[PDB]
Amino acid sequence: GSSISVHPSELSISLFEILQGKYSYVRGQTLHCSLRNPGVFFRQLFIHLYKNALANCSYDHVLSDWRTYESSAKTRWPEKEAQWGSYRRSTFDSWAQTMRMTLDHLLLNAINRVLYAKTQLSYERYVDWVVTVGMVPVVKHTPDHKLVNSIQEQLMKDCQRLASGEKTIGRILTSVTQEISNLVSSLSALYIPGYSEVSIDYDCVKNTFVGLYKQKRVHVEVITMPAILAGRVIFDSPIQRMYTSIMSCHRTAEHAKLCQLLNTAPTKALVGSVNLLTANTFQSLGRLQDPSLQLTSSHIPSGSAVLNSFFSSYIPPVRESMKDLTNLWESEMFQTYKLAPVVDNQGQRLSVTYSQDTISILLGPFTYVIADLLQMELISHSFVSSSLQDIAAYLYQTSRLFVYITDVGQKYC
Amino acid sequence: YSEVSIDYDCVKNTFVGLYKQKRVHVEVITMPAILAGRVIFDSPIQRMYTSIMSCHRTAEHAKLCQLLNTAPTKALVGSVNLLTANTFQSLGRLQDPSLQLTSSHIPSGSAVLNSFFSSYIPPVRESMKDLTNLWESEMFQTYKLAPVVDNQGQRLSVTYSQDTISILLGPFTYVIADLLQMELISHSFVSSSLQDIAAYLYQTSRLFVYITDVGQKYC
Amino acid sequence: SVNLLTANTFQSLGRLQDPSLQLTSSHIPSGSAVLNSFFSSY
């Protein structure tokens, strides 16, 4: 009735080292290294914080500012009050392009500084958790106002570029700033706590699995429940499904190296420091005159009259196990996490991007389950290979601000 | 500033570095594993370290089997460069007992019953052909570099991508130096030229908007 | 015990001088005069 079992066993200490590649390493391990990419989750923080800044609905505030922009352009062009047909088409495009460069300057700078905050979360640990084990330890730290207070002064410094002087131009530009003032302080505080330590901390077995730091307990989040036998715990993991063939490749490679180093001497019979790549052939042969390298002694102890003898040659099948594993891990990430590669003509492989199916498997529980992040929205499929210039360009056409400008532009036509 | 493979680093809860008499601040992008016995890093070279060591030791093994099989006649007992030298001048210098025979003394109390011969067998170049495909899959998946390829699958020089510019030039610009106003480069600008950069930025600049505003009033 | 992929060739051959790796003993107990013999491969 104890109900406790150790998680860091002899199996689990070897599972984390497979990714680290000390024991066995092949070409198929590299496709897991693209699964550890934090830049796709970095795109989710860029889309979320930019969309809600452009989600403010202020109809009368937008239409009142074009009137003051029109009244400014009346004084800049004197003696042209009689004509007004050419006045519309030049100043309307002149009104729209002013508002893009102000959002290019101040709005995008606040997004990237939250995105690249020093030592807060770890997506590379999270892929190192989930692929190895279904459990994700959660250490909740205190939300510290160290990087937060550096942002809260830049809340004022976003206004200091306009210096609160242009109330007409600012009342759109601060309305999108006063929403991102509140949202960053709500997002960055939730961006702090969640931490874990891969291959360091300790985990136990009960009805609900528990983890522990030096003196405190650690909450455990499980995405895939392993099998718990009373003798030995077997995980439901893609590496655990690979563990038989990973062990078999290194032992036959050490067997292959053993047969190489045993067949060094050219003459085998019965009885009954300078690097050689750098050394000259004249200097090497003076050092190779040793009885260990030239002969193999086979003593054959007494009471033994040798009747016959045979010779055995070099035969490990070395590279056939390596060529299987490169096709084996290639079929693993493309079917467990369903990654879609891009392929040029004549079947040439390029870098593998993510898919819509892996963004529900990984970035679903990474965003929603780990941290209490309610308002977050999942990324569309075509945005994973895009650029930061391409993201803010496409989101403008579906934003709130473009609807108001199109409403103004179709009345005057 | 920093000094690669020169300065000194320690291990604590927060990692610290040191110059001759002053402390050096340490910025960490990937946290390694800290075991009490041996420290194992989370590095792409550290993930390669097993196969890098195995290639040189079997190449030194391959060179050892070459230099052991020099003499053409092997039996039991029981300075001018040769590329530059003439064949008549070389054979006068090759009349040496070390190059012609291999002595195998077989010490006393040993009546040799049988004997065998072993030939040259290292698998030399198969380890080298694996590593060229191994590092090719490493930078294209850890840093996600996009190459350009002509027809019939011919490889050209590999440019950067949008994914490596967040991994490398993100922490290089923002984390290291307090550079607030810096903006990350667009994707299509990495292969451009300096004439092409200033041409394209003019069409989205502030100055072109004012000139277009003047040019549409008079039309 | 050092892994042969990591070990030097000079350090390995000092450890490979063992009677188990070099020979196979086939005792063929008494009352048996061996007439012929054969070899089987992989």
mmCIF file of all heavy atoms in Angstrom, chain B residues 25-43:
data_model
loop_
_atom_site.group_PDB
_atom_site.id
_atom_site.type_symbol
_atom_site.label_atom_id
_atom_site.label_comp_id
_atom_site.label_asym_id
_atom_site.label_seq_id
_atom_site.Cartn_x
_atom_site.Cartn_y
_atom_site.Cartn_z
ATOM 1 N N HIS B 25 29.767 38.947 -17.601
ATOM 2 C CA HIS B 25 28.361 38.572 -17.650
ATOM 3 C C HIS B 25 28.129 37.505 -18.713
ATOM 4 O O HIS B 25 28.703 37.557 -19.804
ATOM 5 C CB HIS B 25 27.491 39.796 -17.937
ATOM 6 C CG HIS B 25 26.024 39.503 -17.968
ATOM 7 N ND1 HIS B 25 25.293 39.245 -16.827
ATOM 8 C CD2 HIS B 25 25.150 39.430 -18.999
ATOM 9 C CE1 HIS B 25 24.032 39.024 -17.156
ATOM 10 N NE2 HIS B 25 23.918 39.131 -18.467
ATOM 11 N N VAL B 26 27.277 36.536 -18.388
ATOM 12 C CA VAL B 26 27.012 35.384 -19.242
ATOM 13 C C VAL B 26 25.562 35.441 -19.700
ATOM 14 O O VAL B 26 24.648 35.550 -18.874
ATOM 15 C CB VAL B 26 27.307 34.064 -18.508
ATOM 16 C CG1 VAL B 26 26.955 32.870 -19.380
ATOM 17 C CG2 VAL B 26 28.764 34.006 -18.080
ATOM 18 N N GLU B 27 25.353 35.371 -21.012
ATOM 19 C CA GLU B 27 24.023 35.300 -21.603
ATOM 20 C C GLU B 27 23.822 33.910 -22.190
ATOM 21 O O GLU B 27 24.662 33.429 -22.957
ATOM 22 C CB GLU B 27 23.843 36.367 -22.684
ATOM 23 C CG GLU B 27 23.880 37.793 -22.158
ATOM 24 C CD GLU B 27 23.703 38.823 -23.256
ATOM 25 O OE1 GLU B 27 23.648 38.427 -24.438
ATOM 26 O OE2 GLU B 27 23.625 40.028 -22.937
ATOM 27 N N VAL B 28 22.714 33.269 -21.829
ATOM 28 C CA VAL B 28 22.446 31.881 -22.191
ATOM 29 C C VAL B 28 21.234 31.847 -23.113
ATOM 30 O O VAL B 28 20.166 32.370 -22.767
ATOM 31 C CB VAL B 28 22.215 31.010 -20.946
ATOM 32 C CG1 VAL B 28 21.847 29.589 -21.345
ATOM 33 C CG2 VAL B 28 23.451 31.016 -20.060
ATOM 34 N N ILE B 29 21.399 31.237 -24.282
ATOM 35 C CA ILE B 29 20.295 31.016 -25.207
ATOM 36 C C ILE B 29 19.735 29.601 -25.087
ATOM 37 O O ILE B 29 18.522 29.404 -25.173
ATOM 38 C CB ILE B 29 20.733 31.354 -26.656
ATOM 39 C CG1 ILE B 29 19.562 31.236 -27.640
ATOM 40 C CG2 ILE B 29 21.967 30.559 -27.104
ATOM 41 C CD1 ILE B 29 19.852 31.813 -29.010
ATOM 42 N N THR B 30 20.591 28.606 -24.846
ATOM 43 C CA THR B 30 20.171 27.232 -24.599
ATOM 44 C C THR B 30 20.858 26.746 -23.333
ATOM 45 O O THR B 30 22.089 26.783 -23.241
ATOM 46 C CB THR B 30 20.515 26.293 -25.770
ATOM 47 O OG1 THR B 30 21.933 26.265 -25.968
ATOM 48 C CG2 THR B 30 19.831 26.732 -27.062
ATOM 49 N N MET B 31 20.071 26.293 -22.366
ATOM 50 C CA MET B 31 20.627 25.870 -21.086
ATOM 51 C C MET B 31 21.120 24.432 -21.184
ATOM 52 O O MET B 31 20.337 23.542 -21.533
ATOM 53 C CB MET B 31 19.589 25.992 -19.980
ATOM 54 C CG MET B 31 20.136 25.702 -18.589
ATOM 55 S SD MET B 31 21.374 26.899 -18.052
ATOM 56 C CE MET B 31 20.341 28.328 -17.735
ATOM 57 N N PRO B 32 22.389 24.161 -20.890
ATOM 58 C CA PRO B 32 22.882 22.781 -20.935
ATOM 59 C C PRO B 32 22.390 21.969 -19.746
ATOM 60 O O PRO B 32 21.769 22.481 -18.814
ATOM 61 C CB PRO B 32 24.403 22.949 -20.895
ATOM 62 C CG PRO B 32 24.610 24.235 -20.170
ATOM 63 C CD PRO B 32 23.459 25.121 -20.566
ATOM 64 N N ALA B 33 22.672 20.670 -19.802
ATOM 65 C CA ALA B 33 22.381 19.770 -18.696
ATOM 66 C C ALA B 33 23.556 19.747 -17.729
ATOM 67 O O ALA B 33 24.711 19.599 -18.140
ATOM 68 C CB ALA B 33 22.090 18.359 -19.208
ATOM 69 N N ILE B 34 23.259 19.890 -16.440
ATOM 70 C CA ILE B 34 24.282 19.960 -15.401
ATOM 71 C C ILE B 34 24.115 18.724 -14.524
ATOM 72 O O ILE B 34 23.262 18.694 -13.628
ATOM 73 C CB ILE B 34 24.200 21.246 -14.567
ATOM 74 C CG1 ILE B 34 24.348 22.499 -15.438
ATOM 75 C CG2 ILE B 34 25.292 21.263 -13.502
ATOM 76 C CD1 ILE B 34 23.032 23.158 -15.823
ATOM 77 N N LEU B 35 24.907 17.693 -14.792
ATOM 78 C CA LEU B 35 25.019 16.557 -13.891
ATOM 79 C C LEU B 35 26.195 16.790 -12.948
ATOM 80 O O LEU B 35 27.156 17.485 -13.291
ATOM 81 C CB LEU B 35 25.198 15.253 -14.679
ATOM 82 C CG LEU B 35 25.173 13.898 -13.963
ATOM 83 C CD1 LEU B 35 23.812 13.646 -13.327
ATOM 84 C CD2 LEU B 35 25.543 12.770 -14.913
ATOM 85 N N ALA B 36 26.099 16.218 -11.743
ATOM 86 C CA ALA B 36 27.124 16.405 -10.719
ATOM 87 C C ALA B 36 28.464 15.782 -11.095
ATOM 88 O O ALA B 36 29.497 16.208 -10.566
ATOM 89 C CB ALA B 36 26.643 15.828 -9.387
ATOM 90 N N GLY B 37 28.474 14.795 -11.986
ATOM 91 C CA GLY B 37 29.713 14.186 -12.423
ATOM 92 C C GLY B 37 30.293 14.806 -13.677
ATOM 93 O O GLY B 37 31.471 15.178 -13.704
ATOM 94 N N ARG B 38 29.479 14.930 -14.724
ATOM 95 C CA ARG B 38 29.959 15.397 -16.017
ATOM 96 C C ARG B 38 28.889 16.257 -16.670
ATOM 97 O O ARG B 38 27.712 15.888 -16.684
ATOM 98 C CB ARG B 38 30.325 14.213 -16.921
ATOM 99 C CG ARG B 38 30.951 14.594 -18.252
ATOM 100 C CD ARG B 38 31.365 13.349 -19.023
ATOM 101 N NE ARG B 38 31.963 13.665 -20.317
ATOM 102 C CZ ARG B 38 32.424 12.754 -21.168
ATOM 103 N NH1 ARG B 38 32.356 11.465 -20.860
ATOM 104 N NH2 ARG B 38 32.954 13.128 -22.324
ATOM 105 N N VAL B 39 29.303 17.394 -17.219
ATOM 106 C CA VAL B 39 28.388 18.360 -17.817
ATOM 107 C C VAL B 39 28.224 18.028 -19.293
ATOM 108 O O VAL B 39 29.212 17.943 -20.034
ATOM 109 C CB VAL B 39 28.895 19.799 -17.627
ATOM 110 C CG1 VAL B 39 27.976 20.788 -18.333
ATOM 111 C CG2 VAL B 39 29.006 20.128 -16.148
ATOM 112 N N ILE B 40 26.978 17.842 -19.721
ATOM 113 C CA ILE B 40 26.650 17.544 -21.108
ATOM 114 C C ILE B 40 25.852 18.716 -21.662
ATOM 115 O O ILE B 40 24.850 19.127 -21.068
ATOM 116 C CB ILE B 40 25.865 16.227 -21.234
ATOM 117 C CG1 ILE B 40 26.655 15.082 -20.597
ATOM 118 C CG2 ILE B 40 25.591 15.907 -22.693
ATOM 119 C CD1 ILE B 40 28.004 14.842 -21.244
ATOM 120 N N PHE B 41 26.299 19.248 -22.793
ATOM 121 C CA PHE B 41 25.718 20.453 -23.361
ATOM 122 C C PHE B 41 24.555 20.112 -24.286
ATOM 123 O O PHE B 41 24.421 18.987 -24.775
ATOM 124 C CB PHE B 41 26.779 21.246 -24.125
ATOM 125 C CG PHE B 41 27.917 21.714 -23.264
ATOM 126 C CD1 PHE B 41 29.127 21.038 -23.268
ATOM 127 C CD2 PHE B 41 27.775 22.829 -22.452
ATOM 128 C CE1 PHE B 41 30.178 21.466 -22.472
ATOM 129 C CE2 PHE B 41 28.819 23.263 -21.652
ATOM 130 C CZ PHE B 41 30.022 22.580 -21.664
ATOM 131 N N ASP B 42 23.700 21.105 -24.511
ATOM 132 C CA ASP B 42 22.639 21.028 -25.515
ATOM 133 C C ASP B 42 23.112 21.851 -26.707
ATOM 134 O O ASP B 42 22.771 23.024 -26.857
ATOM 135 C CB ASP B 42 21.313 21.529 -24.958
ATOM 136 C CG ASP B 42 20.695 20.561 -23.972
ATOM 137 O OD1 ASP B 42 20.911 19.341 -24.128
ATOM 138 O OD2 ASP B 42 19.998 21.017 -23.042
ATOM 139 N N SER B 43 23.916 21.223 -27.557
ATOM 140 C CA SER B 43 24.589 21.896 -28.654
ATOM 141 C C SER B 43 24.522 21.009 -29.895
ATOM 142 O O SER B 43 24.520 19.782 -29.773
ATOM 143 C CB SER B 43 26.054 22.196 -28.295
ATOM 144 O OG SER B 43 26.745 22.829 -29.356
#
